[PDB]
Amino acid sequence: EHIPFSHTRYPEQEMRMRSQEFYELLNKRRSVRFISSEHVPMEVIENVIKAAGTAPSGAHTEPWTFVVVKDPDMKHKIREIIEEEEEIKEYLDTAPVLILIFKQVYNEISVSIACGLLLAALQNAGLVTVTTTPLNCGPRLRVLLGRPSHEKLLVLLPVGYPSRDATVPDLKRKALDQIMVTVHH
Amino acid sequence: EHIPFSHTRYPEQEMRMRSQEFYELLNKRRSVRFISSEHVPMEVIENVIKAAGTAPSGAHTEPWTFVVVKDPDMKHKIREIIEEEEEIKEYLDTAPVLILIFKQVYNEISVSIACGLLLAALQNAGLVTVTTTPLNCGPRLRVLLGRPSHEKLLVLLPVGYPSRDATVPDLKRKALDQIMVTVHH
Ligand SMILES: Cc1cc2nc3c(=O)[nH]c(=O)nc-3n(C[C@H](O)[C@H](O)[C@H](O)COP(=O)(O)O)c2cc1C
Ligand SMILES: Cc1cc2nc3c(=O)[nH]c(=O)nc-3n(C[C@H](O)[C@H](O)[C@H](O)COP(=O)(O)O)c2cc1C
């Protein structure tokens, strides 16, 4: 039932180095809304989802389904439903792969954490996406994709290489001292 | 306002390799509830939080505060409040560092994604933790830590090296085919 935990320890200098380099890698991640049609390796899509499935989960429920859509007709119906919901996105057609992350019904926090692992793994693998959370489209997309009544759409990620002429808005991230507070005394 | 996006592309074989190795790294992550007192480098804690601050966020609000507690007396008061809340955890005292992640009030999904990046960065850096979400203790911990009324506690992570005699429950993760569904046609 309980087993000894096996752990790799690095010297302090190597911990500093590794953590600096991983930060630098992740800092290069941007939401990209111009995604090339070019095919991406399906072993890579598999490996990023396996990475996501490593996440912690409340009561070890692993309450996530990663729904992968490549079919051009289906990706178009997804786009149509999302656009219709206004009621007052070309990358949904152009991206070779869509990943839709459904929570099985602290499941929402567990599944969002898994999506953070997925985002890191895409960056590490040299792919891009834009995080979207079309929660109001959830019921219609669930039905379109034949997902059971116990799943609820959380996140939709179009995945591919960036367009050769992709742009991003010129946003700056907060400095460490704007996000980190140390309690003293 | 908009700038060309700069992107590193790897050959397909290198994408496969990188994504496999990152999965293998993350697969080694376990929730560890036996954390050594041994000091951990503060540059590493900084670098894991910087990594977390890379996350996407709804409307680029970056709505996260990472509250770092090292002080033994304060860590004990945190433990006392959590234990009192039953109403029907020694690692909160033993861990050299606690990180409490507060959301600034899709902020909850954005902040949970940042916590997935934080968990990956801790694993990469050779540190361990156990994800906890003491949401019912949120109001009392907010006051104890002098956090403003616009922050809401989401996640508490005790951080350190694992105990030399740490154990974990013998859980198996789901295989890829248990978490991934491909829509055809
Ligand atoms: C929960 C969440 C929902 C988001 N929804 C959208 C969306 O509906 N449309 C969109 O273009 N971007 C969406 N984004 C992307 C953000 O606009 C983006 O993360 C933010 O502008 C910061 O840019 P960056 O990801 O390049 O750092 C979303 C991000 C989060 C995490
Ligand atoms: C949202 C969330 C809340 C959790 N809360 C607790 C907690 O209250 N106490 C605890 O011991 N573990 C908690 N965990 C850890 C889980 O029990 C753990 O992730 C699960 O058993 C799987 O083990 P693993 O993380 O080693 O893969 C929590 C995990 C998640 C993601």
Alpha carbon distance A152, A154 (integer Å)? 6
Q: Is A31 in the pocket of ligand 1 (CB under 6 A)?
A: yes
Alpha carbon distance B41, B36 (integer Å)? 14
Q: Is B112 in the pocket of ligand 1 (CB under 6 A)?
A: no
Task: Say if the Cβ atoms of B181 and A44 lie within 8 Å.
Answer: no
Q: Is A57 in the pocket of ligand 2 (CB under 6 A)?
A: yes
Q: If you measure from the C-alpha of residue B110 to the centroid of ligand 1, how many angstroms do you get, rounded to a whole number?
A: 9
Between the alpha carbon of residue B116 and those of residues A109, A120, A180, B88, B113, the distances in Å are 10, 9, 17, 31, 5
Measure A125 CA to nearest chain B CA, in Å. Answer: 5
Q: Most distant CA pair in chain B: distance in Å?
A: 61
Range of the domain at B3: 1-185
Collect all residues of chain B within an 8 Å Cβ-Cβ radius of residue A51. Answer: 19, 22-23, 26
- Tell me how the structure was determined: X-ray
Alpha carbon distance A114, A111 (integer Å)? 5
CB contact at 8 A, A103 and A154: yes
Q: Which two tokens stand for residue A109?
A: 């926090």
Distance in angstroms between the alpha carbons of the first and the last residue of chain A? 41
DSSP assignment of chain A equals: -EEEPP-----HHHHHHHHHHHHHHHHT----S-B------HHHHHHHHHHHTTS--GGG---EEEEEE--HHHHHHHHHHHHHT----THHHHSSEEEEEEEE--HHHHHHHHHHHHHHHHHHHT-B---B--GGGHHHHHHHTT--TTEEEEEEEEEBPBPTT-EEE---PPPGGGTEEEE--
Rounded to 10 degrees, the C-alpha dihedral B49/A115/B130/B18 comes to -80
Give Cβ neighbours of residue A65 (< 8 Å, ≥ 6 apart).
Answer: A101, A102, A104, A147, A151, B179, B180, B181
The ligand whose atoms approach the alpha carbon of B115 most closely is 2
Q: Which two tokens stand for residue B24?
A: 């293998």
Alpha carbon distance B10, A127 (integer Å)? 9
For residue B57, count CB atoms less than 10 angstroms from its CB and return exposed for 0-12, middle for 13-18, buried for 19 or more.
Answer: buried
Alpha carbon distance A63, B51 (integer Å)? 25
Alpha carbon distance A160, A75 (integer Å)? 14
Mutation target vs B (from A43, A127, A181; most B CBs, 10 A cutoff): A181
Alpha carbon distance A65, A147 (integer Å)? 9
Give Cβ neighbours of residue B24 (< 8 Å, ≥ 6 apart).
Answer: none
What CATH number did the domain enclosing B183 receive? 3.40.109.10
CB contact at 8 A, B179 and A65: yes
Q: Which two tokens stand for residue B105?
A: 């009030």
Distance in angstroms between the alpha carbons of the first and the last residue of chain B? 41
Alpha carbon distance B50, B62 (integer Å)? 12
Per-residue exposure over B59-82, b if at least 16 CB sit within 10 Å of its own CB, e if not: eeebbbbbbbbbeeebbebbbebb
Number of domains in chain B: 1
* Structure resolution, Å: 2.0
DSSP assignment of A67-95 equals: EEE--HHHHHHHHHHHHHT----THHHHS
Q: Which two tokens stand for residue A125?
A: 């693998």
Alpha carbon distance A16, A23 (integer Å)? 11
Residue B160, phi then psi, degrees to nearest 5: 180, -165
Q: Is A60 in the pocket of ligand 2 (CB under 6 A)?
A: yes
Q: Cite the annotated binding site of A for FMN by residue number.
A: 29-33, 57-58, 131-133, 173
